[PDB]
Design a protein around this ligand. Structure first.
Ligand SMILES: [Mg+2]
Ligand SMILES: [Mg+2]
Ligand SMILES: [Mg+2]
Ligand SMILES: [Mg+2]
Ligand SMILES: [Mg+2]
Ligand SMILES: [Mg+2]
Ligand SMILES: [Mg+2]
Ligand SMILES: [Mg+2]
Ligand SMILES: [Mg+2]
Ligand SMILES: [Mg+2]
Ligand SMILES: [Mg+2]
Ligand SMILES: [Mg+2]
Ligand SMILES: [Mg+2]
Ligand SMILES: [Mg+2]
Ligand SMILES: [Mg+2]
Ligand SMILES: [Mg+2]
Ligand SMILES: [Mg+2]
Ligand SMILES: [Mg+2]
Ligand SMILES: [Mg+2]
Ligand SMILES: [Mg+2]
Ligand SMILES: [Mg+2]
Ligand SMILES: [Mg+2]
Ligand SMILES: [Mg+2]
Ligand SMILES: [Mg+2]
Ligand SMILES: [Mg+2]
Ligand SMILES: [Mg+2]
Ligand SMILES: [Mg+2]
Ligand SMILES: [Mg+2]
Ligand SMILES: [Mg+2]
Ligand SMILES: [Mg+2]
Ligand SMILES: [Mg+2]
Ligand SMILES: [Mg+2]
Ligand SMILES: [Mg+2]
Ligand SMILES: [Mg+2]
Ligand SMILES: [Mg+2]
Ligand SMILES: [Mg+2]
Ligand SMILES: [Mg+2]
Ligand SMILES: [Mg+2]
Lengths: 117, 181, 143, 61
RNA sequence: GCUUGACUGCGAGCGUGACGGCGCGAGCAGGUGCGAAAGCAGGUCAUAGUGAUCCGGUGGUUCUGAAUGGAAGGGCCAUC
RNA sequence: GUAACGGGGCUAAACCAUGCACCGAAGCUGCGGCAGCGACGCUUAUGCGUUGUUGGGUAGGGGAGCGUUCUGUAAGCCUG
RNA sequence: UAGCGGCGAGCGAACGGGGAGCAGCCCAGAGCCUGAAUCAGUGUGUGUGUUAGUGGAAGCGUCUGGAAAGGCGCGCGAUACAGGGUGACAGCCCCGUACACAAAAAUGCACAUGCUGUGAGCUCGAUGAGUAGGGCGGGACACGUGGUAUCCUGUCUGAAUAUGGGGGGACCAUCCUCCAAGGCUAAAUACUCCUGACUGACCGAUAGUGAACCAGUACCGUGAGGGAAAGGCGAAAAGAACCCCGGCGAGGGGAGUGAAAAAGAACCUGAAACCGUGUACGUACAAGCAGUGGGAGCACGCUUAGGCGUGUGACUGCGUACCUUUUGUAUAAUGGGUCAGCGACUUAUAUUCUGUAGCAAGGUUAACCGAAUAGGGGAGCCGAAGGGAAACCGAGUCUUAACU
């Protein structure tokens, strides 16, 4: 038997162009270019799902270091103070606290000082 | 005898392929009517390389591997065939889809009479088999789609499956059991 | 019941469809790899082509001959020798019991398998233990 | 179309019981006087086909 | 000085090459030479001194012999 | 076109030696999930409870699937 | 397989067997009785077929609908429920199909017959000469001159006549068979330019013939020759009367037919590339495979009214397309302007291996017959026993005078 290809080809092309809506020009309109940029978008997605963790951790560490130097201590001595005070609060929650409630962070700094000296 | 599903499957696929006939062909780049002229010179131009209009990559060319009239007839082993028929009738009995009577005929070539007899026997999509063949009985069920009337020699396992119940002449049962042995 | 059939599992094997996609493994080149005479349309060595090096079928001596007598001799076991229609063994009736064939002129009665019945044997060559076995059932050497 | 036979291989070979083939040694049609009787006595019988060559004999059959 | 072991048929086993092959070999049967004997000798102290197959030459032959007996030819052994 | 630290810039932010911290990857750990290979008992890999382990990959080898056209099931089913 | 062969690649029989069909005769000659079977020509009759044909059954109501064959309820026919058409899917509306019939006229064939020819049967004998062979050279026999039978002969030769000749794979003898140098022969075998009926796991307008359509046309070429593209309104033209703008146009807005005009003759469906129009958001101190991740603002859509959802993406970290060939590419190495369609490991017979099914020291038929996948048919192939080059032997065999 002879099999024609139009419906299934149109389905695959339409699926890739659906995944490539919002791209510039032939990136949105042309299969030979959109099929590249969707795969490259997959590459960059597979990379940046990792890189969110690095980027948010260095954001968190920046905010903790800022608030610790506001309360008169360094980030390094602060983390060492928490590890010697046996404190397992992570940098996400510490950043959120150091933004919202300053006084709780100040008390944590004072506990780290007392655990340090 | 117990049912050998893969054996019966192989036999009925072979029977259907035997029903299939080999009527197809297309044309190659030998058989597409045209010329052996190279369409344009090998070099000089910026077009593609070119050798013949007859190639399938070109429009209005041949098929890359054209078809031939091929026989789909498989080879069926006689013991495999007969064991499939033994198993298929045993499974008909186990499904309670087989009825045996002495006599089954009617002395007039009338589908009205045949349909009334099948109503009296409560039968809808059935298979008739005989000891020897009656003129009027075959004439009364040629025109009936859900009913085939055959001689006990001319049997097929596919129509032994396909029809909802099978009814058999007792002389036909004797001939079948002699014919299988 | 006709739409209820599947064959034995692992009987029908799927088959190889080459050059029809990456995920098959048979994508580009389809099991044939990159460049080479093997990577061509009907690119193929003949049988026993070892390059220009003289192959094993060609650097050895050829020897022997065919007898035109062994092809019209044959060999006969002991089990068969019972299907001779009655109990006589001849150039005929083995030819007619279809064990040796028409063009056969000479025959031997080699020991192979149990022999059961007394059998008169006429006009053959007979081996040692098989002669003693034919005599153990009750048969006799006879030209 | 039945398979054509490599007639040279059919002349130089014959099959044994367990699927091996037999062959005849080289160095036995001419120069023999500068050779040793020990060597020619080694060469005179027949032998079996080796390991890597069975494909290149069975393909010839 | 004496001599033909630069004899034949075999080979447990080993080595070295992808393969064809190449090489080492105690020991068995026969039958020789040397020594009184125990023993030694299957060429040179060793490692190079070489040529596959096909085709055809010569000698021998418990092989075959296209109806049969022979022969021509083919094979096997030795060799060119 | 500076152009011989990536740069700004540095007398320490450079160099030698010592200590304690900290950052830092898809490595390691924590959680949740998938599959393969075992190893286990009810039971027969139909599965279930763990537990060990593995899971970058071209040519290339193997195993399992989806989707399209046509034939039987189909004078049955869906459909103005 | 045996053989042929730079014994390389390749070519590849015969014997013998199993089947469809089977059928035998005349002249080189005179007598004897003489149409006594044959065929050839010419007609007649019968049968049967071709070239036109004839009859050919039985359904209504309701509902959706532009339209009924569909749905529901109740019937009828069937040696016809093969197929096609009729406003969607019909056994009962139409043509047909099963069945039953038909020829003034020319024919095909098969019988029997009548008319003309030839020749039946018996005796006696006649038995195909520049022919069979042979030398040279080539070709065919599966056989390349090989130790090479056998046929044919272009050149040169050149026997015997039943006590004779030919072949039996160089050749000789024995033996076996045959009677050449003249001719005829049905069938079973091979092919489809054309006609009828039927089948298709063949295609469905880039497929299938080159051609579904005014195709071997338009067009190229002096010529031989090459060689396309292009199907579909709707069920029925009811193909748009009439009014208006515009140039007595092209085109359009209304009316109107129609179930439908966004089915209006470029006409079913109407994708994508490409090109416009409207809305929302962003962009005019900011640089680079244009994304991805985070994320402010803006506009809509939801509510359990916390915000989950979409469109946009100020700013920021990271970040040099794909294929191929490559040791290696962002590479300034190749290929691609883009879309859509087509396009590349198939087929037949052999061999081997795996998986699976059957049977089992057995398995299995092929060609053929056949109410034709059944059943016969077991001619043949493979396997159970090998060894040796082979005669030959056999659970042994080969080497060797001989093995533990
Ligand atoms: Mg778009
Ligand atoms: Mg040409
Ligand atoms: Mg076309
Ligand atoms: Mg074509
Ligand atoms: Mg691969
Ligand atoms: Mg390539
Ligand atoms: Mg290479
Ligand atoms: Mg390669
Ligand atoms: Mg037989
Ligand atoms: Mg072996
Ligand atoms: Mg020799
Ligand atoms: Mg000789
Ligand atoms: Mg002869
Ligand atoms: Mg740390
Ligand atoms: Mg990490
Ligand atoms: Mg990890
Ligand atoms: Mg885990
Ligand atoms: Mg992997
Ligand atoms: Mg009529
Ligand atoms: Mg009618
Ligand atoms: Mg309609
Ligand atoms: Mg004559
Ligand atoms: Mg000649
Ligand atoms: Mg179309
Ligand atoms: Mg107008
Ligand atoms: Mg248009
Ligand atoms: Mg249209
Ligand atoms: Mg700005
Ligand atoms: Mg960048
Ligand atoms: Mg590609
Ligand atoms: Mg290149
Ligand atoms: Mg490479
Ligand atoms: Mg790079
Ligand atoms: Mg560039
Ligand atoms: Mg480039
Ligand atoms: Mg280019
Ligand atoms: Mg495309
Ligand atoms: Mg059969």
């Amino acid at each position: 038997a002879r099999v024609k290809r139009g419906v299934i080809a149109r389905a695959r092309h339409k699926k890739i162009l659906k995944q490539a809506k919002g791209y510039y020009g032939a990136r949105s309109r042309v299969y030979r270019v959109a099929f590249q940029a969707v795969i490259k978008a997959g590459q960059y997605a597979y990379r940046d799902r990792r890189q969110r963790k690095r980027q948010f951790r260095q954001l968190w560490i920046a905010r903790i270091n800022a608030a610790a130097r506001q309360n008169g201590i360094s980030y390094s001595k602060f983390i060492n103070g928490l590890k010697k005070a046996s404190v397992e609060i992570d940098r996400k929650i510490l950043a959120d606290i150091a933004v919202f409630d300053k006084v709780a962070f100040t008390a944590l700094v004072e506990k780290a000082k007392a655990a340090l000296a | 005898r117990d049912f050998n599903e893969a054996l019966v499957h192989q036999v009925v696929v072979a029977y259907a392929a035997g029903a299939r006939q080999g009527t197809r062909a297309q044309k190659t780049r030998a058989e597409v009517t045209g010329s052996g002229k190279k369409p344009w010179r090998q070099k000089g131009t910026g077009r593609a390389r070119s050798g013949s209009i007859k190639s399938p990559i070109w429009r209005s060319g041949g098929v890359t591997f054209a078809a031939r009239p091929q026989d789909h007839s498989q080879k069926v082993n006689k013991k495999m065939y007969r064991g499939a028929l033994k198993s298929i009738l045993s499974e008909l009995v186990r499904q309670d889809r087989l009825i045996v009577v002495e006599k089954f005929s009617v002395e007039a070539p009338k589908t009205k009479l045949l349909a009334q007899k099948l109503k009296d026997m409560a039968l809808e999509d059935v298979l008739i088999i005989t000891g020897e063949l009656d003129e009027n009985l075959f004439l009364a069920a040629r025109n009936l789609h859900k009913v085939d009337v055959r001689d006990a020699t001319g049997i097929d396992p596919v129509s032994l499956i396909a029809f909802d119940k099978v009814v058999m002449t007792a002389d036909a049962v004797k001939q079948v059991e002699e014919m299988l042995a | 019941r006709l739409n209820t059939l599947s064959p034995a599992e692992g009987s029908k094997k799927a088959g190889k469809r080459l050059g029809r996609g990456i995920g098959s493994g048979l994508g580009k080149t389809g099991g044939r790899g990159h460049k080479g005479q093997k990577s061509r349309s009907g690119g193929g060595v003949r049988r026993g082509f070892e390059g220009g090096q003289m192959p094993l079928y060609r650097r050895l001596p050829k020897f022997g001959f065919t007898s035109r007598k062994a092809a019209i001799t044959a060999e006969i076991r002991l089990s068969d020798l019972a299907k001779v229609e009655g109990g006589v063994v001849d150039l005929n009736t083995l030819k007619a019991a279809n064990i040796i064939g028409i063009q056969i002129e000479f025959a031997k009665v080699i020991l192979a398998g149990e022999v059961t019945t007394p059998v008169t044997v006429r006009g053959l060559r007979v081996t040692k233990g098989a002669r003693a076995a034919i005599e153990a059932a009750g048969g006799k050497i006879e030209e | 179309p039945k398979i054509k036979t490599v007639r040279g291989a059919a002349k130089r070979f014959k099959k044994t019981g367990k699927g091996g083939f037999k062959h005849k040694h080289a160095n036995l049609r001419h120069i023999l006087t500068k050779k040793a009787t020990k060597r020619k006595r080694h060469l005179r019988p027949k032998a079996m086909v080796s390991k890597g060559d069975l494909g290149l004999v069975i393909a010839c059959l």
